[PDB]
């Protein structure tokens, strides 16, 4: 209907993530909902999340939808009036949006310390989180070089290099097949994530997993920068266990937590063993 | 090897009996007859005690051209357990156990015997819907082997390719 | 001088390798040489090998040149007349060129046995040796699947896929960044090689080392098919130790022998510990 129009118009901010826009659309449609019962609202918003992930096939949209449903259930467990409960839901959603829209800056502030002077950083594709981290690092009078792969499916590496050149940072574009070649000249690898699975692994661009192995074979540190709304309760046993709704040439793949050193979220610097703890404490 | 190393040294020996053919009991009795402090165990415990073993010494039926092994079943698991704990694996085999063939004759490498050894005939009507396989031999890769002791001395697997060339002709590989 | 035009016109047979054409040109210019001393012949042929390598930056050309120089130095040790020695060199070079042309079939008929029925093979780029091995197995009444990488620098995997489709073989083209994705769905990896280093490793297309690492991480057998005239006495300690004359985005890289299972040459099926043996026995 018109929910897709609003969701696609909310993505006029180039810095706004897809999951953030989906959550904003869900909150707007919860505000404008004329329902008088909690079950009808839950069902309508569930079908709306279904439509949203039908429009955008990213894992972040599904993660945000599940987080919104869990927040709805948590707010409904308390008051049980659906009027005062609705006001509480509205104010809590406002506060949650205001707190989650500034998580990238906090991630950058807490992650930019791990970058030394004169080190070499390896990135896979274009991501706003790595860009903000590198900007916060170069703002602290740090000097380093950046290697970025081209990400052949959609040339996001050239876009990342063009965005980094405006920051006066030496950047070099390498091919996807030359990952194992420049791995010895890189001091650390920093990648983003589209979704963090239960065990601790990530779900990212197709050329990420093969880069986490080549780093593990050389004891290179491998850091993942991702927000908190990307925590999804999924457990892929292998590359085939990933749902086809997210992969569709595959557009995404899974990386095991044993190849990940640290995660930098708005909750802080965590190990791959903390995502499962957070998901269990949330009772999603 | 063990009974010659025991007349001047004293050490611990553990024998894991194979489940289909429990021939490890005979070797255990023959070793205990010489006073070597021999112990008997099953295959399932091979990994369980693997953390308290300093060296593994085995033999084989034949050696392939790439340094691989055609051993008794359950030996690949022992090699994997020794590689997990970085335990050296020694192979005692003479020179007449070198075959120029390469691991490309699958579906016939292992020797299959009657299923009577694994599952008895007195089970009942379930024997008509259950597939029972009893392979006698198994394949051991060359990267899980540390040393080869033969009548000429000690060698590495990465040199076996030479010994074959010193024993057989390339025109007699297919025979 | 106008010698490179004879080497370029020698490669009018699309199935002839570069090293074979270089050796044929060297033998032709040895026949047409009018010198009366062995030192002058050696100097002229070293200069000609340098001129030929200046055009083709492949490692196979240098390997063939060094092999030809070693053959000359070996044939110049028995007769010591430069006329008797010249006739013996001409005859031995004719026999060597006749024997080299039969190396591809000799590798194929010996390597096709390692392919089972219903198997899944993984190839990186276009290689005539791999193509001959695959077409020798389908002639033996065998059915299998092939996954060919795209080779983003220059699209060589598409040519291999077209050849396999012409040979009625089910082939699927994958991206350079998806090697770590389909590695779990493959039974063995058969790749070519432009040059075999002393320690047993190979020098192949840039997207070979990462695939070898991914296959080692998943215990997948990594097979390499290459001729014998590609044996060069080089010892790269890392990726940067490879000479820049062969890499020129790098066009080639080095794979250590620790990730190679077996080698299929015209000398037979060897281990990575047998190339150094031949290089020492040859006294190259």
Q: Examine the domain organization and report whether C125 and C253 are in the same domain.
A: yes
Contact C249 A174 (CB under 8 A): yes
Distance CA C234, CA A8 (A): 57
Which residue has 């593994």 as its token pair?
B56
CB atoms within 10 A of CB C125: 24
Handedness of CA A28, A34, A36, A40 (dihedral sign): negative
Backbone angles phi, psi at C108, to 5 degrees: -65, -50
Q: What are the boundaries of each domain within chain B?
A: 1-166
B23 in contact with C at a CB cutoff of 8 Å? Answer: no
Chains A and C touch (3+ CB pairs under 8 A): yes
Reduced to 3 states, what is the DSSP secondary structure of residue A222?
strand
Chain C hits for A242, Cβ within 8 Å: none
Going by C-beta distance under 8 Å and a sequence separation of 6 or more, which residues neighbour residue B76? B138, B139, B140, B144
C187 in contact with B at a CB cutoff of 8 Å? Answer: no
Among C76, C91, C106, where does a domain finish? Answer: C106
Among C66, C84, C106, where does a domain finish? Answer: C106
- The DSSP bridge partners found for residue B147 are B90
Q: Examine the domain organization and report whether C119 and C240 are in the same domain.
A: yes
The DSSP code sequence of C17-73 is -HHHHHHHHHHHHHHS---S-HHHHHHHHHHHHHHHHHH---HHHHHHHHHHHHHHH
CB atoms within 10 A of CB C36: 10
Contact A239 C177 (CB under 8 A): no
Contact C269 B170 (CB under 8 A): no
Count A/C contacts: CB-CB distance under 8 Å.
Answer: 94
Query: Are the C-beta atoms of residues B12 and B39 closer than 8 Å to each other?
Result: yes
Which residue has 């280093």 as its token pair?
C197
Fill in the DSSP letter of residue C133. Answer: H
Which CATH number characterizes residue A201's domain?
3.40.50.10470
Q: Examine the domain organization and report whether A90 and A140 are in the same domain.
A: no
Q: How far is C281 from chain A (nearest CA, A)?
A: 32
**Of B66, B54, B63, which Cα lies nearest the Cα of B92?**
B63
- The DSSP bridge partners found for residue C139 are none
Residues in chain B after which the chain is broken, C→N over 2.5 Å: none
Determine the Cα angle at C197 with ends C192 and C199, to 5°. Answer: 120
Comparing alpha-carbon positions, the chain A residue that sits nearest to C213 is A214
Q: Examine the domain organization and report whether A128 and A102 are in the same domain.
A: no
Q: How far is B66 from chain C (nearest CA, A)?
A: 7
Comparing alpha-carbon positions, the chain C residue that sits nearest to A237 is C184
Q: Examine the domain organization and report whether C89 and C227 are in the same domain.
A: no
Query: Would you state the structure tokens that stand for residue C84, as one six-digit string?
Result: 């008797």
Chain centroid offset of residue A131 CA: 13
B158 in contact with C at a CB cutoff of 8 Å? Answer: yes
**Overall fold of domain B1-166:** Rossmann fold (3.40.50)
Contact B161 C116 (CB under 8 A): no
Q: Examine the domain organization and report whether A111 and A52 are in the same domain.
A: no
Chain centroid offset of residue A234 CA: 15
Q: How far is B158 from chain C (nearest CA, A)?
A: 6
Determine the Cα angle at B143 with ends B137 and B144, to 5°. Answer: 60
Reduced to 3 states, what is the DSSP secondary structure of residue C155?
coil
B24 in contact with C at a CB cutoff of 8 Å? Answer: no
Q: Examine the domain organization and report whether A143 and A74 are in the same domain.
A: no
Distance CA A41, CA A89 (A): 12
B162 in contact with C at a CB cutoff of 8 Å? Answer: yes
Which helix (H) or strand (E) segment is A268 a member of? strand A268-270
Determine the Cα angle at A272 with ends A271 and A278, to 5°. Answer: 90
Q: Examine the domain organization and report whether A60 and A127 are in the same domain.
A: no
Distance CA A269, CA A111 (A): 8
Q: Examine the domain organization and report whether C96 and C121 are in the same domain.
A: no
Query: Are the C-beta atoms of residues C132 and C108 closer than 8 Å to each other?
Result: yes
Comparing alpha-carbon positions, the chain C residue that sits nearest to A209 is C180
**Resolution value, angstrom units:** 2.6
CB atoms within 10 A of CB B31: 19
Total count of domains within chain A:
2
Distance CA A188, CA A179 (A): 13
Contact B158 C273 (CB under 8 A): yes
Q: Which of A181, A205, A213 sits opposite C217 (nearest CB)?
A: A213
**Of B6, B31, B8, B27, which Cα lies nearest the Cα of B18?**
B27
C269 in contact with B at a CB cutoff of 8 Å? Answer: yes
Distance CA B87, CA B55 (A): 6
Among A72, A106, A140, where does a domain finish? Answer: A106
Chain A hits for C201, Cβ within 8 Å: none
Contact C175 A185 (CB under 8 A): no
Range of the domain at C263: 107-282
Distance CA C176, CA B116 (A): 51
Query: Are the C-beta atoms of residues A128 and A60 closer than 8 Å to each other?
Result: no
Which CATH number characterizes residue C99's domain?
1.20.120.1070
Which residue has 């939808």 as its token pair?
A65
The DSSP code sequence of chain B is -HHHHTTT----EEEE--SSS--HHHHHHHHHTT---EEEE-STTTTTTGGG-S-EEE--SEE-TTS-EEEETTHHHHHHHHHHTT--EEEE--GGGB----S--TTSSSPB--TTTTS-GGG-GGGGT-----B-EEEE-GGG--EEEETTEEE-GGGHHHHHHTTS-GGGS--
The DSSP code sequence of C92-128 is HHHHHHHHHTTHHHHHHHHHGGG--TTEEEEE-S--H
B11 in contact with C at a CB cutoff of 8 Å? Answer: no
Backbone angles phi, psi at C31, to 5 degrees: -65, -45
Contacts of B among chains (3+ CB pairs under 8 A): C
Q: Examine the domain organization and report whether C63 and C134 are in the same domain.
A: no
Fill in the DSSP letter of residue A78. Answer: T
Q: Examine the domain organization and report whether A171 and A100 are in the same domain.
A: no
Q: Examine the domain organization and report whether A166 and A128 are in the same domain.
A: yes
Backbone angles phi, psi at A16, to 5 degrees: -80, 130
Count B/C contacts: CB-CB distance under 8 Å.
Answer: 22
């Amino acid at each position: 209907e018109l929910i897709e129009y609003f969701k696609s118009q909310m993505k006029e901010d180039p810095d706004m993530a897809s999951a953030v826009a989906a959550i904003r659309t869900l909150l707007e449609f919860l505000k404008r909902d004329k329902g008088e019962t909690i079950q009808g609202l839950r069902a309508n918003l569930t079908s709306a999340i279904e439509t949203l992930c039908g429009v955008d096939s990213s894992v972040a949209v599904s993660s945000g939808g599940e987080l919104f449903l869990r927040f709805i259930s948590l707010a409904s467990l308390e008051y049980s009036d659906y009027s005062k409960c609705k006001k509480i839901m509205i104010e809590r959603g406002e506060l949650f949006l205001r707190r989650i829209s500034l998580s990238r800056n906090k991630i950058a502030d807490l992650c930019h310390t791990f970058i030394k002077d004169g080190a070499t950083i390896l990135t896979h594709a274009y991501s706003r989180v790595v860009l903000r981290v590198l900007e916060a690092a170069v703002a602290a009078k740090k000097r380093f070089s950046v290697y970025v792969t081209e990400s052949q499916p959609d040339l996001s590496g050239k876009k990342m290099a063009k965005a980094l050149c405006h920051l006066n940072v030496p950047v070099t574009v390498v091919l996807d097949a030359a990952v194992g070649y420049i791995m010895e000249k890189a001091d650390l690898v920093i990648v983003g994530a589209e979704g963090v699975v239960e065990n601790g692994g990530i779900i990212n661009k197709i050329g990420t997993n093969q880069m986490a192995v080549c780093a593990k074979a050389q004891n290179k540190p491998f850091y993942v920068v991702a927000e908190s709304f990307k925590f999804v309760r999924l457990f892929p046993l292998n590359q085939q266990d990933v749902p086809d709704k997210f992969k569709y040439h595959p557009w995404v793949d899974y990386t095991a937590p044993s190849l990940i050193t640290l995660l930098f979220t708005d909750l802080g610097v965590l190990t791959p063993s903390a995502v499962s703890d957070e998901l269990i404490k949330l009772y999603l | 090897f063990l009974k010659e190393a025991a007349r001047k040294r004293k050490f611990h020996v553990i024998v894991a009996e194979c489940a289909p053919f429990c021939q490890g009991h005979e070797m255990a009795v023959n070793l205990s007859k010489a006073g070597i402090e021999t112990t008997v165990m099953t295959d399932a415990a091979i990994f369980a005690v693997m953390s308290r073993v300093n060296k593994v010494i085995i033999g084989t039926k034949t050696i392939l051209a790439n340094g691989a092994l055609r051993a008794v079943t359950g030996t690949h698991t022992l090699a994997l357990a020794a590689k997990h704990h970085s335990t050296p694996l020694i192979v005692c085999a003479p020179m007449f156990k070198l075959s120029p063939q390469f691991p490309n004759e699958e579906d016939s490498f292992h020797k299959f015997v009657a299923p009577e050894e694994v599952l008895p005939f007195t089970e009942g009507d379930i024997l008509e819907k259950v597939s029972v396989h009893c392979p006698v031999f198994d394949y051991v890769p060359p990267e899980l082997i540390t040393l080869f002791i033969s009548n000429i001395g000690g060698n590495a697997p990465s040199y076996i390719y030479r010994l074959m060339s010193e024993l057989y002709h390339p025109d007699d590989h297919v025979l």
